[PDB]
Ligand binder design. Structure first.
Ligand SMILES: [Cl-]
Ligand SMILES: [Cl-]
Ligand SMILES: [Cl-]
Ligand SMILES: [Cl-]
Ligand SMILES: [Cl-]
Ligand SMILES: [Cl-]
Lengths: 91, 91
């Protein structure tokens, strides 16, 4: 499933149901931080990060998360132009 | 104020008061993501990230945050050995 497929799927779901629809992006190489894409409804997107170990609670980062954070930064830069033509983000 | 001064100050506060004590790290160059250090009480540390614009709510990252995330990764790597001898982190 590509990013665009996920974006499209979350958009359609958030509309049919009138509530946030979410999906974990499976960014290659990430060890612990999980990036979740959210479609918030007239549909705007955001991305939140989560620990696999306390998935529902706010993430506490430690120094061992440095490489994850870099991979997330790289993924953002790699898809930046596309995302900025394709979706609107949360305020 | 160095990282160690902040760590020491938050440790002393979290002990005198028996509750989480927190302070924003002023990592040079960050535009929007704020890293806050927390001493949680028998004292363990964590770091949480926050948007300056919705400081109390969970941060929604967008592609413009890529450089902040890299600077946070660099700061973690720069202080990694020190932190791992000097403090214990949250589970
Ligand atoms: Cl992910
Ligand atoms: Cl965590
Ligand atoms: Cl792109
Ligand atoms: Cl900061
Ligand atoms: Cl935000
Ligand atoms: Cl160090």
């Amino acid at each position: 499933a590509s990013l665009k497929e996920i974006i499209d799927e979350l958009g359609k779901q958030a509309k049919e149901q009138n509530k946030i629809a979410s999906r974990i992006l499976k960014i290659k190489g990430i060890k612990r931080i999980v990036v979740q894409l959210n479609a918030v409804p007239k549909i705007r997107y955001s991305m939140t990060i989560h620990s696999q170990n306390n998935f529902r609670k706010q993430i506490g980062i430690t120094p061992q998360d440095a490489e994850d954070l870099k991979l997330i930064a790289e993924f953002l830069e790699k898809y930046s132009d596309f995302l900025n033509e394709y979706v609107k983000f949360t305020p």
